């Protein structure tokens, strides 16, 4: 990958691999994401950001502060399928001083055809109480010269989707997947779970018959509060519809929410 | 990747995603074991397959793993550049194997290898067989047919036992969700590697490194299954492991690891 002419943004090409596609032979969005988080370290590298840490700033190093995802949505026109080359391109922008985004646009390598686009939004997390807080601004201040100054937007239209309030499912619910647990492959590096878990953990609730009919073509997660190691998780899903559902997950042990979301499918 | 100059194994390069580290910023077992099958996966699609021989497709058989053993000098880093080399030999009636090299791509030392034995499996009824004289003179065109072993000594053969109860330590009710499985809705090989790490106790995993896992495949675990991982040590620290089907109590692997000291 490299950072594109005028050093803004990052691009990198993707090779789908044999496991990372489901029945249809193309990439799952579990997949998608997990490439999404690729090519922002790259990036976070691209510009200095070392691997001794994941993608955290010197500020952050020093702080012992983490980056923690709050939301994400994505969209996909078209799944890549196995051994073709997804391009994806990614850069990160601050809201002010409220918000921090990275955005991405994944195309065909060969014909440039917009195939997904995906926002995302961000804040810190003390690596050992566990605590949350937005991103500061001595931690900003180390990579806003990395990022473009004028709107750049993958969802730039006045209350796009990507920036709908997700209200809370009441029970009972329609469909559920209960006592879902993390094992050490879905822990990141810091030892915490990976933020495409959720994503899968989400979609556990959907039923089969929509997974075998359908393909999905937006999720918007919002991220509460974490999963451990130790914790169980339930899904829950109810359709509130294209098929549309809205899912929460929350802990078996005492039902605190860890996520919300919504998803839209589209018949194969 | 590409076919080497005779055409007899593949070589394909890979660099280490954020998401495939654990806590020392290496890649994992699991990692390890996703780039052996993508790199096994794209030779047999650079020798034609689809992986089945216009034979075996004809009488509805398949390949099956009947053990991956994997042997662990150095694990890449974060971003380093991993060379993977893989060929395949015929064991005659008795199955197929596949071989692993693994390569710092910078320095050209091995820092790893792999070897994989394979069973011809009935796909409809599910029962293993002996591999046919057509469909081994099919294979070996695609084979070295001079022996050519990653493991010439060796553990990698070595008989395993059956963990007897009580285990010392136990994962229980482990399941699979959607990402565990394959394209055809199998759950994948390396879920299971996964699962017999989990009944590990974490003291050991956090200040040892895995040096050696040789696992035998029994039966698959379905979608709709439930898992127990059960761990004994029977050491440097050695352990034997045994999954089973906790609806029945069915054994679906056994295995060994070999953990050294960080």
């Not at 796009?160 to 879902?180: F, V």
Request: glycine share 6%; aromatic share 8%; charged share 25%.
């Amino acid at each position: 990958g490299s950072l594109t002419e005028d050093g803004l943004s990052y691009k990198e090409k993707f090779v789908v691999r044999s496991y990372e596609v489901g029945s249809n032979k193309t990439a799952t969005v579990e997949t998608i994401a997990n490439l999404l988080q690729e090519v922002g370290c790259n990036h976070a590298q691209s510009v200095g950001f070392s691997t001794d840490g994941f993608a955290t700033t010197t500020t952050m190093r020093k702080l012992h502060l983490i980056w923690v995802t709050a939301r994400m949505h994505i969209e996909i026109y078209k799944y890549p399928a196995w051994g073709d080359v997804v391009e994806i391109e990614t850069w990160c922008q601050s809201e002010g001083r409220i918000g921090t985004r990275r955005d991405w646009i994944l195309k065909d390598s060969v014909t440039g055809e917009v195939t997904g686009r995906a926002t995302s939004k961000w804040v810190m997390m003390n690596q050992d109480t566990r605590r949350l807080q937005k991103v500061s601004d001595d931690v900003r201040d180390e990579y806003l010269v990395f990022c473009p100054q004028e709107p750049r937007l993958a969802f730039p239209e006045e209350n796009n989707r990507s920036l709908k309030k997700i209200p809370k499912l009441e029970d009972p619910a329609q469909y559920s997947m209960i006592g879902l647990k993390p094992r050490r492959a879905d822990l990141d590096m810091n030892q915490h779970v990976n933020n495409v878990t959720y994503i899968g953990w989400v979609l556990e609730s959907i039923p089969q018959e929509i997974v075998d009919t359908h393909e999905l073509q937006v999720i918007t997660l919002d991220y509460r509060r974490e999963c451990q190691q130790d914790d169980v998780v339930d899904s829950l899903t109810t359709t509130t519809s294209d098929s549309q559902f809205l899912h929460l997950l929350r802990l078996s042990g005492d039902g605190q929410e860890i996520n919300r979301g919504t998803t839209l499918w589209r018949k194969k």
